[PDB]
Amino acid sequence: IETVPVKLKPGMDGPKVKQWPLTEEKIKALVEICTEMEKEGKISKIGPENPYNTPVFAIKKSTKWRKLVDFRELNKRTQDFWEVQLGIPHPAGLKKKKSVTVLDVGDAYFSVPLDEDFRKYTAFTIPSINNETPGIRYQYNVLPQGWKGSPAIFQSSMTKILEPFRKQNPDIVIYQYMDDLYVGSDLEIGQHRTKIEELRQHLLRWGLTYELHPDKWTVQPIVLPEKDSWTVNDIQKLVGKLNWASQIYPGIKVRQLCKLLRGTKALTEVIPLTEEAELELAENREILKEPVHGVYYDPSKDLIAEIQKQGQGQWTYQIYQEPFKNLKTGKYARHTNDVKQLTEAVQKITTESIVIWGKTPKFKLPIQKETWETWWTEYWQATWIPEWEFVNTPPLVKLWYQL
Amino acid sequence: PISPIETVPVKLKPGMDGPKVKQWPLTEEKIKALVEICTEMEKEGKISKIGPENPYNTPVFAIKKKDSTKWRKLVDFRELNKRTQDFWEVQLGIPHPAGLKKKKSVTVLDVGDAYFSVPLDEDFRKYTAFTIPSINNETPGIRYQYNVLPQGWKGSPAIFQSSMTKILEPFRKQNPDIVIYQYMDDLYVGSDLEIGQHRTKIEELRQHLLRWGLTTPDKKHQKEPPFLWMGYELHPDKWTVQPIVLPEKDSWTVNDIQKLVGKLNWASQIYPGIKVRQLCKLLRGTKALTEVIPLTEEAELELAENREILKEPVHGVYYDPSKDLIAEIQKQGQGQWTYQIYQEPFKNLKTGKYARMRGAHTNDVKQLTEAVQKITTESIVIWGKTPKFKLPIQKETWETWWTEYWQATWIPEWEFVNTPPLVKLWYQLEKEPIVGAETFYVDGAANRETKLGKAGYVTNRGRQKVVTLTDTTNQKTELQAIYLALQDSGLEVNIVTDSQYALGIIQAQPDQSESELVNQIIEQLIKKEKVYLAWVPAHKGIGGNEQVDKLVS
Numbered sequence A: 001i002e003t004v005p006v007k008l009k010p011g012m013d014g015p016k017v018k019q020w021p022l023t024e025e026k027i028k029a030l031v032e033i034c035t036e037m038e039k040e041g042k043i044s045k046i047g048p049e050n051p052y053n054t055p056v057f058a059i060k061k062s063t064k065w066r067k068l069v070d071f072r073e074l075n076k077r078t079q080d081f082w083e084v085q086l087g088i089p090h091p092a093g094l095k096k097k098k099s100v101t102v103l104d105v106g107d108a109y110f111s112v113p114l115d116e117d118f119r120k121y122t123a124f125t126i127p128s129i130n131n132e133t134p135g136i137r138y139q140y141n142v143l144p145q146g147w148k149g150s151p152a153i154f155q156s157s158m159t160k161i162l163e164p165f166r167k168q169n170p171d172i173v174i175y176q177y178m179d180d181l182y183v184g185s186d187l188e189i190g191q192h193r194t195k196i197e198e199l200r201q202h203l204l205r206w207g208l209t210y211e212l213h214p215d216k217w218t219v220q221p222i223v224l225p226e227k228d229s230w231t232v233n234d235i236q237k238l239v240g241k242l243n244w245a246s247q248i249y250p251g252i253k254v255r256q257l258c259k260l261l262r263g264t265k266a267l268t269e270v271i272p273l274t275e276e277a278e279l280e281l282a283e284n285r286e287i288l289k290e291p292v293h294g295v296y297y298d299p300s301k302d303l304i305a306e307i308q309k310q311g312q313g314q315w316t317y318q319i320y321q322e323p324f325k326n327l328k329t330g331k332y333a334r335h336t337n338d339v340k341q342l343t344e345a346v347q348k349i350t351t352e353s354i355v356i357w358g359k360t361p362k363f364k365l366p367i368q369k370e371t372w373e374t375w376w377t378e379y380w381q382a383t384w385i386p387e388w389e390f391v392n393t394p395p396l397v398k399l400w401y402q403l
Numbered sequence B: 001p002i003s004p005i006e007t008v009p010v011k012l013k014p015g016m017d018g019p020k021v022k023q024w025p026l027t028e029e030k031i032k033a034l035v036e037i038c039t040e041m042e043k044e045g046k047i048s049k050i051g052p053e054n055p056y057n058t059p060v061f062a063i064k065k066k067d068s069t070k071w072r073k074l075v076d077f078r079e080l081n082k083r084t085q086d087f088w089e090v091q092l093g094i095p096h097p098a099g100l101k102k103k104k105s106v107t108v109l110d111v112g113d114a115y116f117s118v119p120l121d122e123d124f125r126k127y128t129a130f131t132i133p134s135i136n137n138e139t140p141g142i143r144y145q146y147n148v149l150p151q152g153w154k155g156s157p158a159i160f161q162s163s164m165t166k167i168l169e170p171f172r173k174q175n176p177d178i179v180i181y182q183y184m185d186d187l188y189v190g191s192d193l194e195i196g197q198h199r200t201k202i203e204e205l206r207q208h209l210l211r212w213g214l215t216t217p218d219k220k221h222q223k224e225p226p227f228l229w230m231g232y233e234l235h236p237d238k239w240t241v242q243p244i245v246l247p248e249k250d251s252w253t254v255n256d257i258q259k260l261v262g263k264l265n266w267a268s269q270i271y272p273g274i275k276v277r278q279l280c281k282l283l284r285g286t287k288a289l290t291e292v293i294p295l296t297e298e299a300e301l302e303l304a305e306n307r308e309i310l311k312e313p314v315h316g317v318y319y320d321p322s323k324d325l326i327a328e329i330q331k332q333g334q335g336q337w338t339y340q341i342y343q344e345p346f347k348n349l350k351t352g353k354y355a356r357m358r359g360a361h362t363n364d365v366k367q368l369t370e371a372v373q374k375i376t377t378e379s380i381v382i383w384g385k386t387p388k389f390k391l392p393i394q395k396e397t398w399e400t401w402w403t404e405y406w407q408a409t410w411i412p413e414w415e416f417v418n419t420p421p422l423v424k425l426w427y428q429l430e431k432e433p434i435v436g437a438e439t440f441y442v443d444g445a446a447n448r449e450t451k452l453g454k455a456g457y458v459t460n461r462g463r464q465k466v467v468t469l470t471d472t473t474n475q476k477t478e479l480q481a482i483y484l485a486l487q488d489s490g491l492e493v494n495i496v497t498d499s500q501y502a503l504g505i506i507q508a509q510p511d512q513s514e515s516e517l518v519n520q521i522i523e524q525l526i527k528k529e530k531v532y533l534a535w536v537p538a539h540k541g542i543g544g545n546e547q548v549d550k551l552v553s
């Protein structure tokens, strides 16, 4: 087969990201795997004249070790190719479906040779314990998994493969993103599942050996309590919340509410509700359950996601492009391991984000950089990696999104 | 020799070309020295002479070795190096002795003339051309180019290392029982055979090295244990840092104290409870290395304690893959932490130290967790697995903190160990308002040009108090106002502020800070019985906030 030549962004150079230290068990797994990919000719050993590097890890998908390459740098340095030059259009109908199923079609790429002059940029390194030997270095000879260039390049082979299946069920939406296919229908759940098995067989003739329910995605509104007795404290909290909300949702009002908090009163003190505040309250509740008037998705901007830890296994999140113009808010819940849950939450959020916008968000993560870096691998099950940075949640933000 | 291993292809950075530096004319003895060297190199294949066209040149120089009468060939590749491609890093991270399996028998053997034993990419040789000038330069000089890896060129240490590795590969495949560590041009080799089958496998290893152009020490020039290396003293079944003298001095200079801290920090790898906080406070301030620094009382206390731990020699043991690792941590005092890692108590694989602070305000529970994380990453690197931990904190003290703190956190398998000082939470903020406790509505304020500050409060019991502060920032007044409310309040108090900033600091339950204020606030919070802290939107006319806001201006 003939290879599509690939060009970096002019000026800027390949990736030189250093390999994180790995536990012996994962090294063992990576060796086995890579020894086998090398026999099969997908990768080849490389000399010191290759300066570039990309991190690699082992995840568990199922109890077989899988190999995961972190191409975030590459992808960023490659962006022009897989987004502007080629690049899959994203269907608005995908999010509208009753059921969406995600299939791994990464094995497809291993059958297509990678542009010979691009290979050096796919370099990765298996480390050794205590630096006893030098790492083992490889680059890729075929479309690698996790590189946004691979689906970009395999795109036309993918259209060919899916065309019969698309012709026969023209109300099913199929969306490709990185190593995955996203398949959406409105069929009853059993017919949907049957239609996915049919698809697998199409995939199967070409070497490609869980369900979402997006309709039932709805806002996690900033929720206002329904107290029996109110205290100054509770009203103060109410005002703070509405005070937050009002910077996001046009129409929020707090005046009739403050009138109650008049003078210098003890926090623990009960005060009955003004007839007007009682209307204000309900009127604000109307506004929160609805989408934000004035906020729209700009396809040219990065997505961001903030996650707050609520305790008791609950996690709140928002997605936006410009701070606190929220495109979506939600929650996730339930191994009382903080990092495990957090890892789970990021993948759910990332997945929804792909279904909705065909884009992955940069995460603001409420955890110590080093802690997350040491552990996220142990629970990661996706084939991509979002961009993340680390943040100290503003104490106020957390309570305002409680439930 | 020159190894028969294929060459590494090489290039220069893309928009560039080989150097064209001109030769700085040289004295006659230098010219003579150079010629006597290049003739010799040329006879061994190391270099070849060329007649232009070759347009490239890199200057050469000759120097007199030590005090003796050897001349040496210095080449300045400064310019070619700039024009040469980047190579993948030679080898990042160096083994730590604590990570070595103990070995029945070890042999050290070093490659001779290591760089000159490896070929250079033919297509690249022409950029290494240099010229020995003629006397006073009046005639065309003698031009050579390199065939092998030049001392001083940018690619040499990398291409060498990769060569040694391709060469060693086949023998590693056939001899998995045998361990070879590559460091620079040295080779360290160990197995668990007896002096018989070992020396045998060694000579076999040399002969392999020899087919491949790499000469090595014979059984008679092979150095003997103890080995010294990267600042350690490796023995057959223990290891330690190389001996350390804390010098006797009446007066210390900046330079003297830095070297002492470095020697200390290095020593703390295996010597338990080394401290350097008090010696380090001394370095603070912009001083000249020549300057004498009087030791404070605590710094001389520190040097003392340190001097004592160093008195008897301590050593480390090697790693046994079949056993678990344990790490113990102890609070060694003010933001200082010390840890040990052993497999059978208390014979340490290694030890270490953790001083860092993370931000301006933290408590012990955070700090301990940060050390745990630091120790954890270090184990992954050295032994390829996380240690079993032993911490001076009750599972309940740690449980209370984790669940109520906003950040996600987590440490691997651990258990409690009663090694005081234990880490505890020194106060807890109430989770609801307190009934029948005075409510202080506090506030602070500052004029951006003036730098003058007011800080005060109002209470639901009618008290009011405001004070002035000179040269202060808008956020310093907001803490002051909270200190204020804590000073004049009883054992139980509610406090309302509009400062997210103050709220943030206090709600995180600090118990030490870079701020005297925050230390002051802390000392109060510990003296209290219940304190409940809450936040209100500024300038919405809310409750008592309006009043105390009006009073400060």
Ligand SMILES: CCCCn1c(C(=O)c2cc(C)cc(C#N)c2)c(C(C)C)c(=O)[nH]c1=O
Pocket: B095, B097, B100, B101, B102, B103, B106, B179, B180, B181, B188, B189, B190, B225, B226, B227, B228, B229, B234, B235, B236, B237, B318
């Ligand atoms: C008698 C010392 C045994 C230490 N050792 C070694 C080893 O000898 C060694 C190790 C390093 C990292 C550097 C240097 C130097 N200079 C030597 C080895 C080597 C064969 C790797 C070993 O496996 N086990 C040891 O205990």
